[PDB]
Amino acid sequence: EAAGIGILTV
């Protein structure tokens, strides 16, 4: 189960 949240651009 990969991250569905907390993944934003730098």
Partner 1 sequence: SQTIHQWPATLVQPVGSPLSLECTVEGTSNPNLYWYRQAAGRGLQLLFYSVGIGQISSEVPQNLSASRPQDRQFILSSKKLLLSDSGFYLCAWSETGLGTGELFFGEGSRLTVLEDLKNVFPPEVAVFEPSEAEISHTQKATLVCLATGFYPDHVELSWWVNGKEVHSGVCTDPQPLKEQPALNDSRYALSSRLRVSATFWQDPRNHFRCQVQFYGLSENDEWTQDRAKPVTQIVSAEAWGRAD
Partner 2 sequence: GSHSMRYFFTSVSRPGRGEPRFIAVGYVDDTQFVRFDSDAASQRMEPRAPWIEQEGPEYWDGETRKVKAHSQTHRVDLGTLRGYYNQSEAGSHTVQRMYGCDVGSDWRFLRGYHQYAYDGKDYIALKEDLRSWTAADMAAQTTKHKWEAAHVAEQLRAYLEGTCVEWLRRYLENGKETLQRTDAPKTHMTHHAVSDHEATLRCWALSFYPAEITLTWQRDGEDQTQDTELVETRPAGDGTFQKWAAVVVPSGQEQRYTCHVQHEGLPKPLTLRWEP
Partner 3 sequence: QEVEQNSGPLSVPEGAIASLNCTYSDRGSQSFFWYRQYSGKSPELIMFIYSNGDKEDGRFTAQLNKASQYVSLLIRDSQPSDSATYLCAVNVAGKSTFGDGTTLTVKPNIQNPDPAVYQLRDSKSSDKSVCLFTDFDSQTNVSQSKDSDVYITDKCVLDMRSMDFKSNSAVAWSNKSDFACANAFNNSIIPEDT
Per CB under 8 A, residues contacting partner 2 are 1-10
Distance CA 5, CA 10 (A): 15
Q: How many residues does the chain have?
A: 10
Smallest distance, Å, CB 2 to partner 3? 9
Give yes or no for residue 10 binding partner 3 (CB under 8 A): no
Smallest distance, Å, CB 10 to partner 3? 20
Distance CA 9, CA 5 (A): 12
Give yes or no for residue 9 binding partner 1 (CB under 8 A): yes
Where do contacts with partner 1 occur on this chain (CB under 8 A)? 3-9
